[PDB]
């Protein structure tokens, strides 16, 4: 598939819709949408491994990481496939996302369809925190909203 979409919901007020497009195989993924109800500022933003939301965002498992690498930012070379860095929420709690990534994909081994996209309570430190959790999660904190990534029309 070349188009995907995701509805993010969670415990609190955070919600949104994110779209995906890679218009040619193994090319760059354009991710765009907007998320409301966030605290003004930066929030971690990754694709987690499982699209199981039976137990909320908890059952999504960890960052999508087929290469068994440490946590990093999206520009970094040492990275999880699912590391998409941060989204920034404005003074009304709205974060308009428009991002390009080329390590995620809508087909092949690093396909993200059927997995879970997650917005986080705190900013992702992109692996540079200086502790061990920073190399796992970016110290991004709890999962405010999430959804399974489906084939979109």
């Amino acid at each position, epitope marked *: 598939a070349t188009k995907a979409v995701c509805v993010l919901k969670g415990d*609190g*007020p*955070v*919600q949104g819709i994110i779209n995906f497009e890679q218009k040619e195989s193994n090319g760059p993924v354009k991710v765009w949408g907007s998320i*409301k*109800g*966030l*605290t*003004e500022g930066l929030h971690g933003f990754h694709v987690h491994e499982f699209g199981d939301n039976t137990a909320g965002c908890t059952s999504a498992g960890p960052h999508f990481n087929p290469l068994s690498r440490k946590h990093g930012g999206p520009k970094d070379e040492e990275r999880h496939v699912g590391d998409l860095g941060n989204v920034t*929420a*404005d*003074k*009304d*709690g709205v974060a308009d996302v428009s991002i390009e990534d080329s390590v995620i994909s809508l087909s092949g081994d690093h396909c993200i369809i059927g997995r879970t996209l997650v917005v986080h*309570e705190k900013a992702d430190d992109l692996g540079k925190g200086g502790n061990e959790e920073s190399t796992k999660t970016g110290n991004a904190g*709890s999962r*405010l909203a999430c959804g399974v990534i489906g084939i979109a029309q």
Partner: nanobody
Framework: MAQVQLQESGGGSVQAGGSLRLACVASGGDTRPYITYWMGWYRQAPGKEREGVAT????????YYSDSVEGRFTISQDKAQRTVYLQMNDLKPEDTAMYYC????????????????????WGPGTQVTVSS
């Protein structure tokens, strides 16, 4: 922290042209820090519908005002104390009303943030009377 509860204070009597500050203290409810609200100030004058005056996003800083009060009222918050202040200046006689605090969902979209029907919690009210 049962359910969210709002308490207004600071209403009184003032002559036209005067000032007033109202405060709305929030207590209880889900106290996790990412729980955001549009908080924020409504009026009901004799014989008229309840109307929104000002609102503020407790998870950030955006503020929005009704036309009738833009320029004269200002809304602010002390997030650590869950208090939202309405600084009312250049008061006119028609600002006389019972003033209510109200909390709405933090994901409220533009144009519902300051509408009474989309408010979830209301305070008891504090009366403001402005003399001609």
């Amino acid at each position: 922290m049962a359910q969210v509860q709002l308490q207004e204070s600071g209403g009184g009597s003032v002559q036209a042209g005067g000032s007033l500050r109202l405060a709305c203290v929030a207590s209880g409810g889900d106290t996790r820090p990412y729980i955001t609200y549009w908080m924020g100030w409504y009026r009901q004058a004799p014989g008229k519908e309840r109307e929104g005056v000002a609102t503020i996003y407790t998870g950030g800083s955006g503020t929005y005002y009704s036309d009738s009060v833009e320029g004269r009222f200002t809304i602010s918050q002390d997030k650590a104390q869950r208090t939202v202040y309405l600084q009312m200046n250049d008061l006119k006689p028609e600002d006389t009303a019972m003033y209510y605090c109200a909390a709405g969902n933090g994901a409220l979209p533009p144009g519902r943030r300051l509408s009474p029907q989309n408010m979830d919690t209301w305070g008891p009210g504090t009366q403001v009377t402005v003399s001609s």
